């Protein structure tokens, strides 16, 4: 039993394997906004849009 | 040994000749599948590359400025996709599928032809020639003091020596100030545990996966032996 337990000990005393985990977050924002306000105002003859 | 080589092989994305495709970039775009990366996904791109080579290497541009009198930057072509293949569309655009290797491919990125290079685990034992001595700059990490291992770019005079000698030891030069006598600070090299494994692309710098034995060294430090 001593010897068998020794073998189990050999199996158990194994280095735990570390891994480097690299998770990367990428955010991309593209924004194009165009606004045109066209104005025609005359109070001389009261025509104004 | 093979696993160490496998880690480098995972880090082997940087290639030479940034100038060539800076002069002729293969322009990628596409919102049909609006991604900045994918595995097998479809991107489109404009250039003869669509007409010609089905595979290609996606590289972002870094610059390694050495020889200040010559003031030359031999850049770094960081390979974004592991691979890709094409279908041809009219308009000189192409629709490609992407085998991705951890590097997002900006939707507006620069594409370059595929250049397969054979690397072996036979470099593991090392090729140490002391005469080769030079500074280190331009790590993709950009972080000073990176340790355990990293992909570094040895400098150009260092690069020619590298053409002679593959392996070298790490040195971190630290300035010591005569605070209570003169205030003058003298830089002193401190030999650092850990050595570089160097793979050299002639006509460019040396791409070296350095294994750092504890010592964290700045982005610029003396690699020597």
Concatenating the DSSP letter of every residue in B19-42 gives: HHHHHS-EEEE-TTTT-S--SS--
- A26/B104 touch (CB, cutoff 8 Å), yes or no: yes
Chain A residues near residue B102 by CB distance under 8 angstroms: 22, 24
Cβ-based neighbours of B30, under 8 Å, separated by 6 or more: B42, B43, B44, B45, B107
Please tell me the distance in Å from A21's CA to the nearest CA on chain B: 12
Contact A28, B36 (CB under 8 A): yes
Concatenating the DSSP letter of every residue in B40-93 gives: S--EEEESHHHHS-SSEEEEEEE--EE-TTT-EE--EEEE-EEEEEEEE-TTSE
Q: Could you tell me what percentage of chain A is helix, strand and coil, using 3-state DSSP and rounding each to the nearest 5?
A: 20, 10, 70
Pairing of strands B206-212, B185-200: antiparallel
Please tell me the distance in Å from B148's CA to the nearest CA on chain A: 12
Contact B164, B154 (CB under 8 A): no
Q: Which of B168, B186, B165, B169 is nearest to B177 (CA)?
A: B186
3-state secondary structure of B122: helix
Which structural technique was applied? cryo-EM
- The residue of chain A with its CA nearest to that of B103 is A24
C-alpha to C-alpha distance for B155 and B150, rounded to whole angstroms: 16
Q: Which strand (E) or helix (H) includes residue B10?
A: helix B2-11
- A26/B107 touch (CB, cutoff 8 Å), yes or no: no
Please tell me the distance in Å from B104's CA to the nearest CA on chain A: 8
Chain B residues near residue A19 by CB distance under 8 angstroms: none
- The residue of chain B with its CA nearest to that of A24 is B102
Burial class (CB in 10 A: 0-12, 13-18, 19+), A44: exposed
Contact B140, B78 (CB under 8 A): yes
Pairing of strands B26-29, B43-46: antiparallel
Under an 8 Å CB criterion, which residues of A touch B?
22, 24, 26, 28
């Amino acid at each position: 039993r001593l010897d068998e337990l020794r073998r189990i000990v050999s199996q158990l005393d194994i280095p735990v394997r570390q891994v480097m985990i690299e998770a990367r977050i990428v955010e991309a924002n593209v924004g194009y906004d165009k606004s045109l306000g066209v104005r025609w105002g005359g109070a001389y003859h009261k025509g104004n849009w | 040994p093979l696993d160490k080589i496998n880690s480098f092989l995972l880090a082997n994305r940087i290639v030479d000749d940034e100038k060539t495709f800076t002069s002729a970039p293969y322009i990628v775009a596409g919102n049909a599948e609006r991604i900045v990366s994918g595995t097998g996904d479809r991107i489109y791109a404009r250039g003869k590359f669509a007409d010609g080579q089905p595979a290609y290497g996606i590289f972002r541009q870094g610059k390694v400025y050495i020889d200040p009198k010559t003031k030359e930057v031999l850049g770094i072509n960081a390979d974004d996709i592991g691979g890709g293949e094409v279908v041809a569309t009219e308009g000189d655009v192409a629709t490609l599928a992407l085998t991705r290797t951890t590097q997002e491919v900006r939707l507006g990125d620069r594409l370059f032809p595929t250049e397969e290079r054979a690397v072996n685990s036979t470099f593991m034992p090392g090729e140490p020639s002391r005469e080769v001595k030079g500074e280190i700059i331009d790590v993709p990490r950009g972080v000073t003091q990176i340790g355990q291992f990293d992909v570094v770019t040895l400098n150009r005079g260092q690069r020619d020596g590298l053409a002679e000698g593959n392996v070298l030891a790490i040195y971190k030069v630290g300035e010591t100030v005569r605070d209570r006598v003169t205030g003058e600070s003298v830089k002193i090299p401190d030999e650092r545990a850990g050595l570089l494994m160097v793979f050299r692309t002639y006509k460019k710098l040396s791409y070296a996966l350095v294994l750092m034995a504890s010592r964290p060294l700045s982005v610029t430090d003396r690699v020597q032996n």
